[model samples]
Target: TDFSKLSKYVETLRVKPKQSIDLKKDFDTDYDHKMLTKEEGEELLNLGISKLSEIQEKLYASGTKSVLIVFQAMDAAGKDGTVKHIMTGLNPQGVKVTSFKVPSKIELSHDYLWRHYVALPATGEIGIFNRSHYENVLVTRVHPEYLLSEQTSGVTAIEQVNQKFWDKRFQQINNFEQHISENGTIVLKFFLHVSKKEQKKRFIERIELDTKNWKFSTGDLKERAHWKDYRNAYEDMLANTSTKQAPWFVIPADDKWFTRLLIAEIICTELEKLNLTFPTVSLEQKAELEKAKAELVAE
Candidate 1:
């Protein structure tokens, strides 16, 4: 697949450090520059996945760098599907996929980020977070009452959890991301930007389609009711937290195929920047390997 088209356009999606973001004016969920047909998009995405698999092997072999891919989106925005597709052809052992649900009793007892920090990928691993730390800002920001459970000092009441509260959280997140990045983890975040209309269509499909019924939830609609608030939460999170160490990419999720293609391209490109290479054996190691090969052949 030709990447010239991708390189030029992918930068448009990235949230620059200290940039102000307005989701309504800065991005469109419906945007697709190529206007590729379904077949074309699939073909390109398949190529992209294969390319990603190759780079992922280098990542695992080098064992020098780790990648953390964070996906956040509204319901029916194709987070699961995009993750499933983008990971195609990747080595399962090298990839760690985490879908964070509600905080467990154990989780709630700890700091908000403890669970996520513990779940981070080891060296040479590609970690995919289906819904990540951003949820603390996105979901909990929408429902500040959720913070009451964390029992954090100075936040005993919802009244205390205001702009200062969230700004502090954003600073904490930035520090966390920078610390990891300094230690060889590449942080990439994606907000699957889907239009409300597209989301409604997908939700209806989930309700009507037998195969997809398991994915539907009445709570999805409950969250949908707070769409504007979530949008504001996301915009603030993006603007406040996007840093040189961790950049947010606002992907147009309205078109699933294009979204997959774009993400695959960006990820592959980022991995390529590492210039990863497999370790070459020393002369002694090569001699030992030859002896083992000869013994196996004789057997």
Candidate 2:
């Protein structure tokens, strides 16, 4: 049940600072280390979730540092399920899950990063963002026309939104993370790497299963068509933005159990690294507790 120590596979998943990655060569979409069986993976994941709950208690008590977990992936990549399963054992009061969808009119009025900045977790809380600010680069990068809607300066026409534009945005994102991390937040980004074939399998299952019927949409197929473009955007984003302070972990998502287990291990390990402990009672507080106990006994 000690999830503090991470496995070698889990540590290797982290995209090192300034590490350039070739998704085709460097990462496997369905990699499962030790070839763990589904039952074993689930058992380990359950234990990890239990340990995470303990860490969450200390995190809530200490009230000094916070955790920000970001999830980015293809349509059927299991972000929602993974988050739900891993966070199931945690104290709800200390965990906040935010899902960022399309920008509204008010959101468009401000800078893209502004909405995300406001959603950041406060001290003693663990915030999970599903489809986070990286969408600015991942989604919009695939369709630069989407950037035009933002009405950003020097981007009136699509032509203005070139490679330089994205590079600057990457730098801005790095600055954003750096600022938050320097204060108190521990940032972790997970890119759920699901294979094209596996995604098709999940989509078909969604269509076939009544329980998953609501999850299916025509838009999912529309995005799937542009998989190559999205992959390129993701590669660029990971290459440029992953830093020592805020790291990105490229997790294989074909096997849901393994993905969840790996994520659980990484999260628990990072949180455990904080070495958080409950606040100790002072001598004055001990005296007060003795007086209160005596009064209760007399009653």
Candidate 3:
């Protein structure tokens, strides 16, 4: 049972490779397709979550495939909430969520991708990256000084990391994603596009509202100051690395309800693409089970 026939239009969120994406001019921050009245929204979400759980069940039991869903966005773009709502009914045992924080000392000890490698999901599981290896470009690209932390030989300073540096990183990401797809793991990436006005609204709420006070931080404002930079990094990422293996979805995030609905549709539609079925028992095992059944009946 589908949450609704609405998934027929899920392609609305898919951003094609090399497509020029101007965050200010391209994507909507609110949902005009956002939804119906109260009950309508309820049913749609209920249906979406139910279908998502069903597909995930098959995906986990099939044991031959896996999915990697990535969430990348500016602070307060509803990344956590969207993931929580979309993944609500999934079997937690088969899912792993890894939030990539500021790299730890141990993480900095190795290559930029080492920590991401370890966080990837194994067979029959779903891996969710709160923020992912794209930081190699997104954050580091926005502030090139951060790249020095990677400790590469040729890249000692921002000036040294010319076009070649970016080109190589893009190639590495595409290759890694392609390698995973070739090995049976499908990847879905989302960039939650929250507008500056909406972000400021949420930021103010965090500062004024008692419950959300913990979420307020001066650093958020500092990052907001660099919104244009982040958007550029994101646009470049979409143009360069959104390959056939892993396409990026630029979702409108000003409205959380619509965001969740769209995400639910995207995830369910992708999971349905997989050839998932429960593992089959051997004929010998079937016969043994029948024999055991007869013995138990006689007792």
Candidate No. with top TM-score? 2
Please, what are the lDDT tens digits per residue for candidate 1 over residues 8-123?
77888999986898988998897745645778778988988988888888888876889999999998889999998877678998999999999999988888889999999999
For each candidate, C-alpha RMSD in Å? Answer: 1.9, 2.1, 2.5
Note the Cα lDDT for every prediction shown. Answer: 0.87, 0.88, 0.81
* Residue-pair clashes, model 1: 0
lDDT of 3 at 266: 82
For model 2, the superposed segments whose C-alpha errors exceed 4 Å read 1-6, 32-35
Task: Compute the lDDT of residue 253 as modeled in candidate 3.
Answer: 86
Q: Could you tell which candidate, 2 or 3, scores higher by lDDT?
A: 2
The prediction achieving the highest lDDT against the true structure is 2
Task: For model 1, state the Cα shift of residue 65 in Å.
Answer: 1.2
- Ranking, TM-score, top scorer first: 2, 1, 3
Please give the range of 10 consecutive residues that has the lowest summed lDDT in model 3.
1-10
**TM-score against truth, every candidate:** 0.94, 0.95, 0.90
lDDT of 2 by residue, 48-136 (tens): 89989989999999769989999999988898999888677888999999999899989998998999999999999999999899999
lDDT of 3 at 207: 88
**Candidate 1 segments exceeding 4 Å error:** 296-299
